[PDB]
């Protein structure tokens with residue numbers, strides 16, 4: 058009973074968080090095996106940030122300039138390299154708390170948990186989605202850079218995000234664990250406006266299926282629609298076009314509830330056209346799009 | 362930048378979760394020092410649940426009937442006792458992962474994180490509030506009993522909730538770690554309807570302060586009100602009466618933003634009377650009440 062914006066248990070990731078300081082900048086690093094990963098902008102001063110030449114800035118840095126502290130103990134840095142927008146600091150000690158892990162580059166619409174950290178210490182955990190414009194709507198303050206996003210499958214942590222910056226619009230941009238930014242963003246204090254933040258239609262449908270499973274059924278109607286008819290409405294409301302791949306991914310939810318995907322699309326179409334009329338769905342007055350069909354099945358089945 | 366429903370990092374609590382089985386019932390237990398705490402209804406069969414005599418049921422149970430497994434290893438049970446609605450299973454081994462901890466009984470309106478578990482394994486973490494009718498709006502399935510709610514202050518975990526049941530209305534009831542239920546609920550499969558779920562006014566104001574700090578200011582108006590005038594409106598909308606204690610607790614947020622508490626109450630009064638007019642605040646189309654003033658300061662300052 059009930060449906061919540063649930064994050065993965067953060068313990069396996071908390072055991073990897075370290076503090077990295079270079080000069081006067083301190084941010085978070087991720088310690089896995091004998092490597093600490095962190096945003097390369099740790100080498101910048103606020104003055105460098107306007108147009109930094111990372112290769113030139115990195116030449117003036119030696120292994121001893123990177124101070125890495127895991128809890129209250131200092132790690133010895135024996136190597137450093139830049140991979141895209143991340144620094145890889147080789148340390149002389151493998152993290153004994155290293156979980157089974159993978160680095161994955163997620164697709165827009167996919168969800169993940171964030172362990173927000175400051176000075177290598179965890180502050181909180183929340184669930185995010187990679188928006189269709191490649192930003193995330195997080196909760197990060199100065200010092201949060203290097204905090205990571207991840208998913209967990211039983212005992213394997215899949216790291217998908219590392220926090221790098223806030224755009225002037227208060228939205229967040231970062232990289233995968235290979236240092237490649239999601240979207241067109243650059244690690245520079247410059248004019249970077251985000252594109253249209255469209256709604257993740259397949260996620261909204263998944264959440265309507267979660268609502269039906271949990272008893273919130275007022276929005277079920279007597280109608281059906283087609284993928285092309287539904288997409289005409291989705292375009293008008295800045296919703297992502299729904300594909301047959303999306304319909305297929307909603308198959309288990311359609312099977313569990315007995316509500317055909319296209320019938321649920323017709324409920325969604327009427328919700329878009331008429332609004333909620335002051336009503337709520339799963340305690341929300343808007344259509345929630347940060348639950349994937351996998352998340353809904355996971356939460357509704359109790360996967361650990 | 363940004364404001365999220367954030368839970369505490371769950372690692373310290375994940376290290377305490379164990380599985381407890383008695384007969385054919387399996388639920389979660391909390392292992393702290395050499396004691397495992399779990400709901401006493403672990404001793405019941407579904408047939409017992411209608412009107413169980415826990416003292417009589419417990420007489421037929423010996424230490425060897427309580428199977429406690431921490432990960433893949435079995436704990437030896439050397440003692441058992443019932444304290445209100447919880448069982449305390451004394452084991453022969455202190456949990457080596459026991460964090461600094463306290464048991465606290467929270468007040469309605471206070472928030473906490475829940476680590477939902479099944480078979481002693483963590484599934485997810487989310488943030489809850491103890492409702493004014495002493496229920497929680499969680500996300501729990503069969504097997505989730507014994508999952509716990511907690512707050513963390515630097516290194517000390519304050520355990521405040523242990524999950525016991527779902528009411529016929531899909532809301533959740535449970536106890537503090539002394540086994541006393543929050544509210545009038547009993548651990549019996551019987552007619553237990555919840556009272557009025559009023560809105561936690563002081564939390565809504567805290568969240569409006571969070572919105573102002575994060576740039577969402579459209580709802581600020583040219584008005585002020587009084588505590589008595591505001592409470593007349595709060596009563597009409599099933600909001601909890603605001604006291605001078607609540608005004609005092611909002612003091613740091615009022616100081617940070619320069620918006621007097623009573624002016625923010627007047628913004629809230631107009632939001633209640635006129636609605637959102639299809640607009641949003643911090644990505645929500647309703648007034649959020651599960652952030653305390655402490656939570657807002659914590660998130661907006663980056664406490665770890």
Ligand SMILES: Cc1ccncc1NC(=O)Cc1cccc(C2CC2)c1
Pocket residue numbers: 098106197198199200201202221222223243244245246247362
């Ligand atoms: C202040 C804050 C709040 C939330 N999240 C992150 C931050 N910090 C920054 O964005 C720091 C910064 C400042 C200008 C540019 C850059 C680019 C190299 C990435 C980085």
Ligand SMILES: Cc1ccncc1NC(=O)Cc1cccc(C2CC2)c1
Pocket residue numbers: 058402410501502503504505506525526527547548549550551
């Ligand atoms: C099925 C489920 C879903 C979510 N949360 C909890 C549960 N389980 C129960 O409520 C089990 C149960 C069933 C009747 C009565 C009792 C009372 C002794 C507490 C307990």
